[PDB]
């Protein structure tokens, strides 16, 4: 059983959007559908509820204006539409049913209020300058969040540490460093995957000694 | 609207040792003896999840470590024994009276024995100084506690502006920390310098752990 969300959405201030929730396993019509809003490093905040049966919603007041909730229960989907975006409305939305002893939650939606242009990394390889070994990946540049890293495509998972990225003149950075026994690198081959969902882009890049 | 208002906002608890937190309520979120109170825990980059309803009781699949207590505006948290994977920050949440709000939230830290850094220094890629920039990348891995500071020099001298700095969350395997430290340069003034030194002072130790290289080399 799972509350399914709507994609990544980069929208520019002042505009509206529109997010979409839709169960698998139930109906919307026989419960609560609740949406939760988290900014960057904040805490939870409840912005309300709607019973899809008889269309009542309620709301946090905080977002009353902005917010509206819907649904429509032919298509099993209940809706989030937030206007006169500003930065302050950057952040994961929650589809959740809470309810008084059993809650589902969705897995989140990101939305990003910005004008700043949707940019692909560039990945380069971090290899020592000259027991274990550390080795990295600086991913420079992209915009939006996020990027997901792997290494040997998820075959290393052990000794890997990726670092929150951190925004600069509109563009994010972040690197990822690997562990590994000395005796397997540079022998046996190592490369960091970097996929970028906003520009259906991934790069695999190998670690090469310099 | 009711408001939750948890403590602490921050601890730190030993492994092994019992960990309480506290919401107090702005007004009774009880009706006919029940309390309509959850506790929520959540972990670094996930949703979260449900760990006690109706105040007292334990969500199916949560271990018997978690237990909630309290009435009316008065409710605790208590985790023990506290295990490494119960790093995490904790909500409370009414569902009494729209709006259904949460706590301010409370960060669990699990205090372990304290570590030094790996510390780790890589120059430049070629393809990305062929490309026009210049990043030298210093990771500082696998350290406790949290606090800690890098200092950067080129050719002896500090260097401040054009660090970048970012910290993991705590480790839920082993308790501790990391953080990437970045220095941003134009490639001229990369190749203008020989060498670039990356310096980390860590409460186990007054001598810093330093490490470099020459560009030249």
């Known amino acids: 059983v799972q509350l399914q969300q709507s994609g990544a959405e980069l929208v520019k201030p002042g505009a509206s959007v529109k997010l979409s929730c839709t169960p698998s396993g139930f109906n919307i019509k026989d419960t609560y559908i609740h949406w939760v809003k988290q900014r960057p490093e904040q805490g939870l905040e409840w912005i309300g509820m709607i019973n899809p049966a008889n269309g009542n919603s309620n709301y946090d007041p905080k977002f009353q204006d902005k917010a509206t909730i819907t649904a429509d229960t032919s298509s099993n989907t209940a809706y989030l539409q937030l206007s006169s975006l500003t930065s302050e409305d950057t952040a994961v939305y929650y589809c959740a049913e809470i309810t008084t002893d059993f809650d589902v939650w969705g897995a989140g939606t990101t939305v990003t209020v910005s004008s700043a242009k949707t940019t692909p990394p560039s990945v380069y390889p971090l290899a020592p300058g000259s027991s274990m070994v550390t080795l990295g990946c600086l991913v420079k540049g992209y915009f939006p969040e996020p990027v997901t890293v792997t290494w040997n495509s998820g075959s290393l998972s052990s000794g890997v540490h990726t670092f929150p990225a951190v925004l600069q003149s509109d563009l994010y950075t972040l690197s990822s460093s690997v562990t590994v026994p000395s005796s397997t690198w540079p022998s046996e081959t190592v490369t960091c995957n970097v996929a970028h969902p906003a520009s259906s882009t991934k790069v695999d890049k190998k670690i090469v000694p310099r | 609207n009711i408001v939750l208002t948890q403590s602490p906002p921050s601890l730190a608890v030993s492994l092994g040792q019992r960990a309480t937190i506290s919401c107090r309520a702005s007004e009774s979120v009880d009706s006919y003896g029940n309390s309509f109170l959850h506790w929520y825990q959540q972990k670094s980059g996930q949703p979260p999840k449900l760990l006690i309803y109706?105040?007292?009781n334990l969500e199916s699949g949560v271990p018997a470590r978690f237990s909630g207590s309290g009435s009316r505006t008065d409710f605790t948290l208590t985790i023990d024994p506290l295990e490494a994977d119960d790093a995490a920050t904790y909500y409370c949440?009414?569902?009494?009276?729209?709006?259904?709000?949460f706590g301010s939230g409370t960060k669990l830290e699990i205090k372990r024995a304290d570590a030094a850094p790996t510390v780790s220094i890589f120059p430049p890629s070629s393809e990305q100084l062929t490309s026009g920039g210049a990043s030298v990348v210093c990771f500082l891995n696998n350290f406790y506690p949290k606090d800690i500071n890098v200092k950067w020099k080129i050719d002896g001298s500090e260097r401040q502006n054009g660090v970048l700095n970012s910290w993991t969350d705590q480790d839920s395997k082993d308790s501790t920390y990391s953080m990437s430290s970045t220095l941003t340069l134009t490639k001229d003034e990369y190749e203008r310098h020989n060498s670039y030194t990356c310096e980390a002072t860590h409460k186990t130790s007054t001598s810093p752990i330093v490490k470099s290289f020459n560009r030249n080399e």
């Open positions: 949440q009414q569902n009494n009276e729209a709006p259904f709000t």
């Open positions: 109706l105040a007292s």
